[PDB]
Structure formats: structure tokens, C-alpha cells
Amino acid sequence: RVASGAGLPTSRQTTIMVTKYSEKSPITIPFELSAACLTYLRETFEGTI
Amino acid sequence: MDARAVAKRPRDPADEDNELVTALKAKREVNTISVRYLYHADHQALTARFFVPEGLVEFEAQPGALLIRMETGCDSPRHLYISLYLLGIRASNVSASTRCLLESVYTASAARAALQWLDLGPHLLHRRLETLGCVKTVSLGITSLLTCVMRGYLYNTLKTEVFALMIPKDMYLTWEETRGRLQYVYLIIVYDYDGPETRPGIYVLTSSIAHWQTLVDVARGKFARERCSFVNRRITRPRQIPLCTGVIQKLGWCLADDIHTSFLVHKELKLSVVRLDNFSVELGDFREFV
Amino acid sequence: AMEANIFCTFDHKLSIADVGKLTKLVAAVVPIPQRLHLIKHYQLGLHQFVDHTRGYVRLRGLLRNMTLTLMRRVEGNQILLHVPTHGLLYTVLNTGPVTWEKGDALCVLPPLFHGPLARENLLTLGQWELVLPWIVPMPLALEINQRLLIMGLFSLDRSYEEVKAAVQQLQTITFRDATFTIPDPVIDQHLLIDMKTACLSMSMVANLASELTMTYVRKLALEDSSMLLVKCQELLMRLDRVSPDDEIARLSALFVMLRQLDDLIREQVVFTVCDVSPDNKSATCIFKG
Incomplete structure (x- = not known):
């Protein structure tokens, strides 16, 4: 506050409270895979070059 | 609870420090504000x-005067704070020379408005x-900020010197040839129920009478x-409603020895x-009384 | 350094919502039938005196002699109450429907709004409902007393439309930014008992004072040392243009009907506003008892 002059309107003691919040924004970039890469990676084939 | 603490003497308030003094002394800092002696602490006179x-605060710069x-x-300016002298302008009790005196000082746009609002409505003054x-x-500002008291004595800050109550001579009224040790001061608005004028009479009663019946007997x-x-207005004019021919209330009590004649000066007017x-x-x- | 207070307790359980409701009424007036020290919650306010058959006048008669107090603080342990004293200032809430100004003479009134309401939903327990008396400026209290008495006086002629128009005129009351109305005292086309005896005593003292006057001024006229007496009898003689034990009984009857009207013909100021806070929820007033 500022000390006002004599006879002037004064200023009162002021408390003030603000409450910020949060948002939600979940993201997703899905990817697909063919059966060829899963079949030839997760399963073992014969010994050929 | 203990007999040591119960029979302990009561604490002097002027000897113990303030709450602010012990609050500053606990955390041990220093402020530029001097705080060790709070003012107005030993003030029994509850004030407001x-x-x-500005138009009503003349003959008020000297301390000590009523306020009504x-x-x-x-709606908006609904309550005016009129001094006693502007009230005495309207009253029929005051002498016409003093009336033309104190009307000549109260020439203001607010004072005449209060004078119109006094006699405009159908209500009486009381x-x-x-x-x-x-x-x-x-405060003597562009608007004035006066300090009145509800109960207690009239004194300057630090109680360096007491403040007196002023009343003009025409409102002054005593009903005994000699006074007691104590005397109360009252307010009297008596109604003349005359045909041409209904302007009341304003009085103060510096009397030593406290009981209301023994006051109202001498008042009658x-x-x-x-x-x-x-x-007479009751019998001459039918279907009129007159009430409270005089009213009375307690204002205070004085010392019964400092009562003396002085004068107020405002713009070289005695x-x-x-x-x-x-x-x-x-x-x-x-x-009230009828 | 403690002060002399009153420790009031609550035998019902109290919610945190009810504690937060109770802490809104910090500077609220509470009447108490006798200033004890450890009082229960059953004697806070006027719910001890809420009655279906009784009315406003007996509430005013009880409130003339109740010990009014102020609250200090609310705790989960207990509740603090403060008895005021004369010549000291206190903060007091404006729970009344009318805003105040500085220097207004204030006095305490029984609540016109009764029973369940959107404003009377304060601290309501199971069998208990905390009610608070109103703190009204003095001329509005005088107006409410006069208007309620005269609305009680028109109880026996509600069949006439003109009397209903006069009642509807009386039932609305204006004030400074205040246009509240009051409930009519006649219910079930009958009047409640205290208001009935009050207006009956009013009519009785009016009838007896109209009756016995001429004989008394005729007796006083033969010692005429006051010229007011002859115009006093001339008033009654222009208005018209007995056994001695009957006289004694009529005098005692007139004075007892006046004595039963003592609380209504006058009242005392309780507070006067030293200053008023902004938003007009409360004001700092000096007690006057």
C-alpha cells in the first residue's frame, strides 16, 4: 500500500489467493507390423543363408 | 489455580509492554516505526x-460542540450531520439579533438545504x-472528518488538556438559584403548538436533578x-394529532464550578x-412529556 | 490473561460444515435465559420459546428480560460466549433484514420470519433449530409494533373488503432500500392469545379512560388552582357536543390493564452504531443496557 495524505481515503489490508490448475493431454502414435516380421523374428527358422 | 498465582497482584497495563513490542522482541528485529508506547491506549472515552x-463545519473548528x-x-444524502448552532437558527427560542448574526455566518448551500429539510416534512423535530x-x-479538509465521542470525557490526545462544552446563551437555562456539587446537563425541545409558527424552543438544563419524575415536575x-x-390547539383544531409537547434526554454531567461565560469567534464574529x-x-x- | 466468558457445549454431534456455518456467526447476538457458566446448546436463542399457539408478543415479553450475549469463538472442544456490559463497544453482526447507518439507535426484536425458511436454516440439529433475534433500528421497531398492533385490532372484521385493503396496506412496510413484508397475525380466522390480551387491554384502558374521566375532573374542579383543569374539562364537554366500590375496581382494572401494556408502550435502546463496516454484514456498536 501507499500512505495517503491527511483526510485522504486510505487503503485496507488485502489478502488474495490464486489457484492455478493442470490439464490433461495424452498422446499416441501407434504403429502396425505385418505378420512377416513377427513370424521371422520371434520364431526361429532353419539354418539357411 | 495455585494460591501463589491467585493471591498474585494484578498486572499494571502500563508496566507490561505491548503485543507488538513482545512480537518484535521475540524474533529480535528492528523497524523504523517506533512502537514501544502505543497512543490512545488509556482512553476510556469511546469515540467515533x-x-x-464543508457547508456545516463553521463554528466547529474550535473543539467542543454538539452534533445531531x-x-x-x-435516499443518497439522507443523514446530515448538523451542528447545534444551525439547529438554533431554526428555533424560535433564540433572539433575533443573534439569529441574524449566526445566520450570516452559516451562508452555505448545505446549511440552507438542511434548514429546508428541517421544516419540510410533517414530522416534528424530536x-x-x-x-x-x-x-x-x-480535520478541516475539503470534506471535514470530525471526531465525536459517545461516552466519556472530552480531551486532547495524550490527555494534555481537557476540552470544554460550548452552548450559546439563549439555549442556556437553569431552574435553581444555586447549584449542587454535581449537575447533569440535558436537552429540551419544547413545542409551541401555535397556529402561525410551530418552531420549537431549544434548551439545555444544567440541573442537579437525576430522577425523571422530579425533573418532569419542574419541567411542567x-x-x-x-x-x-x-x-388549546387540541380543542380549537379537531382531527389533528399533536404529541410530545416537550422532549427530554440526558447529555452528561459537569463539575458545577467550571461553568463560566466565554465567547466563540468565527470570521471575527463574537x-x-x-x-x-x-x-x-x-x-x-x-x-417525552406532555 | 483470560476474560470472563461463558462456555457453551453441544450434546449433538457437529459436522465440519455445521462448524463452518457456526463460524459465520462470530459477532452474533444470542439470548440466554440465565447467565450460567457451563450451559448446554438447548438455551441458545429462542428455540426454547418457539410455540405453535403463542405469538410475537410473548416473545417480546421474554426478550425484554433475556440475558443477551455475543459469541467469541467456536471450537471442536466447546463454544465461547461473551456477556457484554454497559459503556463498552463490541462488533455485532447485522443479521437483520435492514442495513444500518452510523449513530442509529438499535434494539433487539423477535424474528418475524418463523419456522422453516431459506434464511432460518442455521445450525439446525434434529430437535433443535438455532434461531437468532433481529437487530433493528429503533423507529422501524416502533413502526412494526404499531402496525402489528393495529393489524391485530382489525381481526374481527376481515369479512369486509375495505378492511382487507387496509390490512394489505399495513402488511407492506417500506424503509431505506427495504421493502420487506410481515406475516399477518390472524391465522385460522383467529388471533393468538398474547396479541389478543394485549389489544384487549388496549381497548379496555381506552374504554375505562373514556368512562371515568368526567366524574374525576368534576371532583377536581372544586379546588381549582390550575387553569389547565378547566380547559381539560372543556375538551371533554366539547367532545360530547356510580358505586364507590365500582369506582375502586375500575381504577384498579385500568391500572392493571396499563401495567400489562408496559412492555409495548415503551422500549429501550440496546445498541447504537459507533461506526458501520462496509458490506454491512456487521458494525461496531456500543452496548447500552
């Missing part, structure tokens, strides 16, 4: 503060007016003509007054 326009709020059915007590300090005995005028130096206000509601 009032804003009022009024009611007006207009149902309209309401005291506040006596004033002790001024001194104002028998006014009650006769009341009952106005002779009865002055009561050591006086404490004591307010009360408007009782």
Missing part, C-alpha cells in the same frame, strides 16, 4: 469519526433528530404555557457562550 460536507444527525426521506455527542477534533411547572398552547470545562458525555434516548 464522521465525514460531513437527521433523517430525510431522500422524531427526526438524533444526537451523537460532542466533538473533539477537526416551567413550561405550563406550552402545554396550555398544546391543549458569539457569547456558556462553557463547561471538565465535562463527560452521557447519551440517552428522547423521552
